[PDB]
Design a protein around this ligand. Structure first.
Ligand SMILES: CCCCCCCCCCCCCCCCCCCC(=O)O[C@H](COC(=O)CCCCCCCCCCCCCC)COP(=O)(O)OCCN
Ligand SMILES: NC(=O)C1=CN([C@@H]2O[C@H](COP(=O)(O)OP(=O)(O)OC[C@H]3O[C@@H](n4cnc5c(N)ncnc54)[C@H](OP(=O)(O)O)[C@@H]3O)[C@@H](O)[C@H]2O)C=CC1
Ligand code: SF4
Ligand code: SF4
Lengths: 363, 90, 150, 216, 62, 199, 135, 383, 119
């Protein structure tokens, strides 16, 4: 149980054909973070079971991630049915929950996804007896006294999970950056493609964004260390930034020479977002609706979302988190700049380059 | 002008699994049914390589080589092309 | 004769009347699947004769005046999910022009262990899987030794 | 540039009697006597052109490969105009483990010949690009597969293997499956090379009889 | 590490062709390496390995 | 026709050569200069008014009104022979006992190493396999295993329509190969009644 | 041979045959004659004097040239020389010019300069049918 | 002025080309190959001689049995094995069927690259007929593994020659209706005449063979100069052109199809009765009835299907007039049941090396014509 | 004065001249600097500092040349440089005097029964 999870059945040096001994069930495996977690587990020789609700075309990318027989795909998942949850975890000694929601729909509310399903999942996990680890994902700004509904339902579900499954680990990362993220992508869709970009108040609320590969490494580091069972970890990058600094960094990176943002009082932003929030129910959910066009985002922007003092973070897992503002994490937003990424004139350094290279590049 | 696509029974009238005449395929020669000795026909293991005496003080006469060549159109002799490769009677 | 055409259409479709044929879902799929439409409406109603019927209900026709390699064809009974894996092996060599034998002219020897032909199960969760698979009733660990249990 | 179409009738013959007799019997002695310093060893064996004849194999030093090949191309009795291939054979038991092999064809007199050079891993072989234009890609492939360096080549670079491929695959001490393998990584979003792992390792079957006499 | 050795005659047969008796006629000396880890494939049971020198000394080097 | 013209030359060096020198008149594959009025009219009716495009157009219009060679798969099939090498299968005697006796000859001859065999003795003393796998994604469908088998146990049957949606469905074990043989036994026996005259 | 052109070509006229197979365009536009062959062979006979008198290379080249000149002398028409030496005369003139060109490179390399006790091993092959089939 | 060359990358989607242009005129072409290099020469050292035979079907996979032929002949020469008469006739007949298949594909793929789409669809039904001929004797439409050491694998089934004669009776009509669309058409001539010219000296200096060599006025056919099996008995002509053109190669290839039809007709009438396999039981496996009834046959069946025959120590190079040129195998034997070294010589490897000197002075729309007229397949190029 | 014609330092100078174009083309401006890249390529050269044969030196320089044009012609991308050049160097200089007192033997013992193969 302690460190018998990672040692007792480990066969091979740890590549694609090796065996790690982990059978894991990842809920929400076709999502943004879940795909990276499923890739992290399967590449080391673990069997990963992936139930999903969507069409098979949106889950086909998970089939590549592991050797023959080690990626198991279970379509038509209904999380209101306990039989599907029971079948999906029936051979697993690790359960990882990445199921979450950002907007409400006439079929699904925040309590159904953040409260009721994690409680029933923790109960059915404790019923089996062979599940040695339950990794539940919540947010850094989760709080029971939060005006935003999703943060409050997330904290309530964290309490229910720690109640029903006492050794379950609660993971609370900050904003996650990546190619398919929900943080820079919507901010770039707000800087471009709109007449103006509203900023709540002065934009001085602080955040701690983190990289998706560091969170994927954090899950494996949690599975290694037995002490982290039953704890709560906050995952945040090495830099604390305000939203105005994030907007300035995106405007400098995109090479946009016209600041289209406008600072607005919070009541004005809520008055803008109110007509498309009283009609969010009785509707099956519309494409290209931003998760920033809600009052819950406005309430989140009136507070800090950072790692608390004395909390367990990346350093207790042995991980030095990568920088988010520069390097490989900022390379996808550099592709959306005006004109294209491109190299340059490339002629100052081609002086003492050999003969065929300059003609090959037509310099 | 011969037409592509022949009609019924003008091409592949019988399927290969319904051959109208039974086939009797020879798999051995009648000369070897009762005369089975092998060392008289062991061509694989009877070839030899021999180291020649060291080709140093030999006498290459070019006069004999060019004395056997023709000088007129008639008296030119040509090596005919071999009709088949050796079958050894089989 | 159009009466011959309609009699051929009813014996090929398996319906009882033209009203039952044109008001069926089989005609509805034949409006959207043209391969089935051609096979039922043109090929099966043309020159040719019925040869036989297998135990899955498929009908087999032949026409010796046709071109070579287009002399034989099948009308599947499953109109909505037709598949060549439902052809029994005693009709497979006839329809693929491997031999000229079918049950109507040849008495095949039936083994006592013979499994009948049915549609493929690929794409569903009742397909074949190896014994080390997750979908098995009991997955195998293929260790070639026994561990000591205290 | 030879074997122009000259006879308009069907020809039922191959070569003339005197030149075919000279090529099939006297060519080894002729080459040895005319250019003795070029030849170090000769084998007359089972005839690349046909199953019915014998044909020579000439061993030479790398210092005289180019003059010997020029002589074999341009001499009036040996007009070997076509170079069919250049390759190598690895003999790890020898002090010089490589044998570079050149096959030639004479369209003028329906002949063939084989020329060999023995070198180790660090002795360069002179290029034959100026003598034969096909020698370029064959020498590039021989360098790629065996690591034989051909001095004086215009652009000796690998032609067959992967872009970053170090190692010469046709050596006897190189593994059949190699050292690295290739897969797509979802995290790095790139096709990545990794150390080799096999789901089923290769089964080597040792069939060789302890009574067999032919093993050399 | 490598081992240089000439393998002995098999006990099952009496012939001597693959021995050091015919050493000048036939190459008989071998280079062999120590084994590395092997395990079983979970799906089929086939023997898996990560050793690149698994058969190169026993097949090719004489 | 295969004749050449000065002007219809596809390159530039020959185009420059034909308009500055009369070396093309020596070559016998060229069309000669017209000598009188009627030959000039024939040459102009060749170049202008096409008539070489029209012959190909008449041929393709004749093909438009001709017969077609398309078969209506899967209601109509192609043509194969009893020697056809399809899906591998394991066979039984008419009693119901397996023909295979674990000789491991088919495993030895397999150039792809697509066969994996393990065996021990059965409880009645018989020599039978406990594992017989064929990796169909490693197989090359040569038929050498069928040739090497001395008891006609492994065959390549007449089935070619066995595409799947997962690759794990194409790693056949012993039970599925016996199920294939039990499915295809009568057709395999009909094929082998002809092919035993030749083999 | 078979001519792929659909027109009717004589090919008994030898100049037409030399035109059709590309000898005029690709090898030599000037027609080769018996006198040019004699001149080229005498050029070889002059060029070979750079080799030593006792060398087998000089004897080989000289004997080949002497035989070629004897064929040229005993045959007046060029079709007869074509039928004897089994080529076109343009090919034969090119052969003689190439042989004359070869001499300074061989002479610079000096293959005749081996020691007196020079030795070359030769291995010959004997077929099995020599001792198995009938003598 | 000081005009630098403009370079271009031509296709990852398996030929990669790096061109240089001085406007609309190419100055250089550099093919980058190895995208189909699967290392078959290394893998053949780990196979027995029967095990490594189906590698050769996958070298020139448009012309399979011709690739098998040279490997089989190289083994047979070192083994000193004689092939019986009927097997030699069968080998010649199926070699010519193979040549017809290859030339159909080559000419119609070339004419489709130029822009004519109909001849492709017309010739592939004839290709389907010849694939049925492959399948009826070997059970495989393409990778037959039919030619073996000492003969062929199985006998011809009863009823094959009847159908081969019925196909050959109408093939000339098919070739005739093929030429009505291309031979006397001005667009095809303007695309093909005087494009990529090869003279005889350049052809021999660049190691050319096959129909390239015959279109430059060289009378060189390996089936007439160094014959193998029963090709010396066959009566046929060598087609000769003299420009070195794409158009002349197209005409030579059509005439070679006619001559292959002539050889096929001669083989259909002179097919003898007798053995199709060599009776040396220590090389050729026994029949299946003989194996189940005599002890020596079962021992030879067991040993030939596991260890295989031992080839005596030596070397040879053997070549075949493959439909793309000279295909040769250099086999090196140490004495074992496995080849010590097996070098494969492919004609398309030498033909593709010429693209730097053939495309000079041409335009971008003539590169695909040059590649099509060289008749290249990258399985044999990239071994 | 410099062994075997000083060809090692001439090739090192050629690669150092080629290096900023590699940094621009592979977009490694914010990943590594030219000084550390020069130190890394220098560390590649010291591994063969005890070669006693000039022909081995010439072959090594030829092979290193072919590596540098396969980096110049974008036949290996930035992730190849990451996984083959600079992270092995940072692993060889990052694990020195670790925060744990375990010997290399005990780390190898706890990892697996056999030594690691490759990187
Ligand atoms: C339905 C679609 C119909 C078209 C189908 C066929 C498409 C063919 C496309 C290619 C045509 C080639 C072409 O036009 O060639 C030109 C000749 O034809 C032409 O110029 C043809 C157009 C003109 C028709 C004839 C005009 C003169 C007739 C008599 C006039 C005087 C008497 C009456 C007043 C020039 O090719 P070239 O070889 O000649 O080029 C001389 C230098 N190389
Ligand atoms: N920066 C971030 O993104 C942060 C994320 N988290 C948490 O991490 C987890 C991963 O987030 P991320 O991947 O970015 O978000 P995604 O929307 O990409 O992932 C959510 C996944 O849950 C599935 N899902 C949602 N609702 C339901 C439902 N009612 N029934 C079944 N499946 C459902 C979705 O499947 P489908 O495709 O069918 O909708 C999807 O695969 C989330 O749960 C989130 O709460 C926490 C802090 C920060
Ligand atoms: S058919 Fe060929 S590849 Fe398939 S199992 Fe038999 S020998 Fe192996
Ligand atoms: S299938 Fe045949 S060859 Fe293979 S092990 Fe069984 S009996 Fe032997």
């Amino acid at each position: 149980y302690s460190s018998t999870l990672m040692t007792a059945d480990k066969l091979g040096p740890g590549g694609r054909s090796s065996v790690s001994g982990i059978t894991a069930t990842v809920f929400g495996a076709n999502g943004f973070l879940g795909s990276y977690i499923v890739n992290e587990l399967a590449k080391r020789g673990s069997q990963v079971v992936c139930p999903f609700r969507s069409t098979e075309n949106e889950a086909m990318h998970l089939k590549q991630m592991g050797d023959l027989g080690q990626i198991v795909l279970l379509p038509e998942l209904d999380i209101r049915n306990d039989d599907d949850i029971k079948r999906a975890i029936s051979r697993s000694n690790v359960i990882i929950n990445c199921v979450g929601m950002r907007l409400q729909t006439k079929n699904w509310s925040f309590e159904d996804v953040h409260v009721d399903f994690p409680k029933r999942l923790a109960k059915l996990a404790a019923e089996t007896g062979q599940v040695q680890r339950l990794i539940h994902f919540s947010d850094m700004g989760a709080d029971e006294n939060h005006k935003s509904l999703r943060m409050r339902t997330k904290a309530v579900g964290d309490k229910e999970v720690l109640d029903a499954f006492p050794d379950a680990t609660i993971v609370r990362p900050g904003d996650i950056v990546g190619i398919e993220d929900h943080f820079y992508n919507y901010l770039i869709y707000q800087l471009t493609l709109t007449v103006f970009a509203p900023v709540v108040e002065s934009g001085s609320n602080k955040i701690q964004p983190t990289y998706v590969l560091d969170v994927a490494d954090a899950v494996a580091a949690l599975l290694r260390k037995p002490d982290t069972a039953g704890k709560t970890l906050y995952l945040g990058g090495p830099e604390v930034l305000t939203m105005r600094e994030v907007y300035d960094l995106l405007l400098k990176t995109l090479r946009i020479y016209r600041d289209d943002t406008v600072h607005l009082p919070a009541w004005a932003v809520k008055a803008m977002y109110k007509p498309f929030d009283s009609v969010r129910r009785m509707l099956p959910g519309l494409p290209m609706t931003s998760p920033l066009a809600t009052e819950d985002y406005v309430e989140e922007m009136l507070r800090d979302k950072v790692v608390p003092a004395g909390a367990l973070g990346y350093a207790d897992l042995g991980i030095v988190p990568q920088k988010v503002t520069d390097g490989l994490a900022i390379e996808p937003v550099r592709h959306a700049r005006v004109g294209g990424y491109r190299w340059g004139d490339m002629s100052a350094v081609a002086k003492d380059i050999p003969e065929s290279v300059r003609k090959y590049y037509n310099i | 002008f011969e037409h592509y696509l022949p009609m019924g029974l003008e091409y592949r009238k019988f399927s290969p699994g319904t051959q109208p005449v039974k086939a009797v395929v020879p798999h051995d020669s009648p000369k070897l049914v009762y005369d089975i000795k092998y060392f008289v026909r062991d061509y694989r293991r009877n070839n030899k390589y021999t180291a020649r005496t060291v080709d140093a003080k030999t006498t290459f006469d070019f006069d004999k080589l060019y004395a056997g060549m023709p000088t007129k159109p008639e008296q030119v002799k040509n090596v005919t092309r071999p009709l088949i490769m050796p079958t050894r009677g089989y | 004769s159009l009466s011959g055409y309609f009699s051929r259409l009813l014996e090929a479709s398996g319906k009882k009347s033209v009203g039952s044929f044109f008001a069926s879902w089989e005609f509805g799929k034949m409006l959207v699947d043209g391969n089935l439409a051609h096979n039922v409406l043109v090929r099966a109603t043309g020159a040719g004769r019925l040869v036989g019927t297998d135990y899955n209900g498929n009908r087999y026709y032949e026409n010796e005046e046709a071109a070579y390699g287009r002399r034989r064809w099948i009308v599947y009974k499953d109109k909505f999910d037709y598949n060549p894996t439902t052809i029994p092996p005693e009709w497979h060599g006839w329809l693929n022009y491997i031999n000229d034998y079918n049950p109507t002219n040849t008495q095949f020897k039936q083994p006592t262990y013979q499994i009948e032909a049915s549609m493929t199960k690929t794409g569903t969760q009742t397909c074949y899987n190896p014994k080390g698979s997750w979908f098995s009733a009991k997955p195998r660990n293929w260790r070639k030794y026994e561990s000591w249990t205290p | 540039g030879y074997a122009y179409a000259r006879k308009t009738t069907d020809k039922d013959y191959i070569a003339s009697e005197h030149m075919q007799a000279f090529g099939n019997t006297q060519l080894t002695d002729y080459i040895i006597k005319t250019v003795p310093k070029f030849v170090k060893m000769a084998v007359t064996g089972p005839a690349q052109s046909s199953v019915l004849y014998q044909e020579p194999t000439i061993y030479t030093t790398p210092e005289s490969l180019v003059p010997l090949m020029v002589f074999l191309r341009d001499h009036t009795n040996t007009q070997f105009k076509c170079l069919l291939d250049v390759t190598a054979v690895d003999f790890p038991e020898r002090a010089a483990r490589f044998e570079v092999v050149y096959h030639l064809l004479s369209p003028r007199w329906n002949n063939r010949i084989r020329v060999k050079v023995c070198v180790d891993e660090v002795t360069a072989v002179p290029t034959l690009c100026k003598v034969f234009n096909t020698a370029n890609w064959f020498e590039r492939e021989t360098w790629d597969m065996f690591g034989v360096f051909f001095s004086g080549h215009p652009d000796l670079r690998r032609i067959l293997t992967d872009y970053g491929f170090t190692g010469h695959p046709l050596r006897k001490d190189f593994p059949m499956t190699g050292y690295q393998e290739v897969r797509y990584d979802y995290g790095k979003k790139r096709v990545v090379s990794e150390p080799l792992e096999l789901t089923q390792e290769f089964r080597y079957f040792d069939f060789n009889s302890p009574w067999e006499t032919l093993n050399r | 590490k490598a081992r240089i050795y000439a393998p002995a005659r098999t006990a099952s047969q009496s012939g001597l062709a693959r021995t050091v008796d015919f050493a000048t006629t036939t190459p008989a000396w071998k280079i062999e390496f120590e084994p590395t880890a092997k395990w079983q494939n979970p799906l089929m049971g086939w023997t898996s390995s990560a050793d690149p020198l698994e058969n190169v000394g026993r097949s090719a080097l004489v | 026709g295969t004749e050449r013209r000065p002007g219809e030359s596809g390159a530039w060096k020959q185009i420059e050569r034909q308009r500055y020198a009369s070396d093309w008149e020596n070559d016998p594959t060229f069309k000669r200069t017209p000598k009188n009025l009627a030959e000039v009219l024939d040459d102009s009716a060749s170049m202008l008014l096409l008539t070489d495009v029209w012959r190909g157009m008449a041929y393709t219009l004749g093909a438009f009104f001709d017969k077609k060679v398309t078969i209506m798969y899967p209601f109509e099939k192609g043509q194969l022979s009893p020697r056809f090498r399809g899906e591998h299968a394991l066979r039984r005697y008419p009693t119901g006992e397996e023909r295979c006796i674990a000789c491991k000859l088919c495993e030895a001859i397999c150039p792809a190493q697509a066969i994996t065999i393990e065996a021990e003795e059965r409880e009645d003393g018989s020599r039978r396999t406990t594992r017989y796998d064929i990796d169909m994604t490693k197989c090359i469908y040569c038929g050498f295993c069928q040739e090497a088998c001395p008891v006609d146990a492994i065959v390549e049957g007449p089935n070619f329509e066995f595409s799947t949606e997962t690759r794990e469905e194409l790693l056949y074990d012993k039970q599925k190969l016996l199920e294939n043989g039990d499915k295809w036994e009568t057709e395999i026996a009909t094929n082998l009644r002809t092919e035993s005259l030749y083999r | 041979f078979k001519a792929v052109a659909d027109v009717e070509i004589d090919f008994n006229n030898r100049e037409v045959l030399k035109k059709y197979v590309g000898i005029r365009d690709h090898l030599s536009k000037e027609p080769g004659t018996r006198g040019k062959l004699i001149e080229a062979l005498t050029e070889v006979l002059s060029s070979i004097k750079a080799a030593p008198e006792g060398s087998d290379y000089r004897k080989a080249v000289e004997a080949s040239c002497i035989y070629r000149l004897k064929v040229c002398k005993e045959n007046e028409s060029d079709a007869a020389i074509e039928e004897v030496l089994d080529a076109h005369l343009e090919e034969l003139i090119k052969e003689a010019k190439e042989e004359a060109r070869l001499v300074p490179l061989i002479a610079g390399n000096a293959p005749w300069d081996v020691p007196a006790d020079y030795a070359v091993p030769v291995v010959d092959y004997t077929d099995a049918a020599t001792i198995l089939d009938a003598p | 002025a000081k005009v630098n060359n403009f370079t271009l990358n031509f296709g990852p989607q398996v030929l990669r080309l790096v061109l240089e242009m001085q406007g609309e005129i190419i100055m250089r072409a550099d093919p980058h190959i190895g995208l189909l290099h699967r290392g078959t020469e290394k893998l053949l050292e780990y196979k027995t001689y029967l095990q490594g035979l189906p590698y050769f079907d996958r070298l020139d996979y448009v012309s399979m049995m011709c690739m098998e032929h040279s490997y089989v002949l190289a083994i047979e020469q070192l083994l000193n094995v004689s092939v019986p008469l009927r097997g030699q006739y069968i080998r010649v007949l199926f070699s010519e069927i193979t040549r017809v298949l290859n030339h159909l594909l080559a000419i119609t793929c070339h004419s489709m690259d130029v822009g004519a789409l109909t001849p492709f669809l017309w010739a592939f039904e004839e290709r389907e007929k010849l694939f049925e001929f492959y399948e009826r004797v070997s059970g495989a439409r393409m990778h037959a593994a039919y030619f073996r050491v000492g003969g062929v694998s199985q006998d011809l089934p009863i009823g094959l020659l009847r159908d081969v004669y019925d196909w050959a009776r109408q093939f000339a009509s098919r070739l005739d209706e093929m030429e009505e669309l291309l031979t006397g058409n001005r667009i095809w001539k303007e695309r093909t005449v005087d494009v990529g010219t090869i003279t005889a000296q350049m052809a021999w200096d660049w190691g050319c063979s096959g129909p390239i060599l015959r279109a430059s006025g060289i009378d060189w056919d390996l089936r007439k100069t160094q014959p193998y099996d029963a090709y010396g008995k066959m009566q046929f002509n060598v087609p000769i052109a003299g420009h070195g053109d794409c158009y002349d190669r197209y005409l030579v290839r059509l005439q070679e199809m006619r001559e292959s039809l002539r050889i096929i007709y001669q083989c259909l009438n002179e097919m003898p009765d007798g053995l199709y396999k060599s009776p040396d039981g220590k090389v050729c496996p026994p029949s299946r009835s003989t194996m189940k009834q005599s002890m020596e046959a079962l021992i030879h069946h067991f040993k030939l299907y596991t260890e295989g025959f031992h080839v005596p120590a030596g070397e040879t190079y053997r070549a075949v007039e493959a439909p793309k040129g000279e295909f040769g195998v250099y086999l090196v034997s140490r004495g074992g049941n496995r080849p010590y070294r097996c070098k494969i010589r492919s004609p398309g490897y030498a033909h593709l090396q010429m693209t730097d000197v053939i495309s000079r002075g041409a335009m971008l729309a003539d590169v695909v014509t040059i590649i099509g007229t060289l008749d290249v397949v990258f399985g044999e190029i990239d071994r | 004065k410099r062994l075997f014609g000083g060809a090692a330092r001439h090739f090192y100078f050629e690669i150092c001249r080629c290096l900023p174009f590699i940094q621009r083309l592979h977009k490694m401006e914010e990943m590594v600097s030219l000084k550390e890249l020069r130190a890394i390529v220098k560390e590649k050269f010291k591994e063969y500092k005890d070669v006693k044969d000039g022909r081995v030196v010439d072959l090594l320089i030829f092979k290193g040349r072919e590596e540098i044009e396969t980096y110049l012609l974008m036949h290996k991308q930035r992730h190849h440089v990451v996984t083959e050049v600079v992270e092995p160097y940072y692993a060889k200089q990052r694990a020195v005097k670790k925060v744990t007192t375990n010997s290399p033997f005990l780390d190898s013992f706890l990892s697996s029964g056999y030594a690691a193969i490759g990187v």
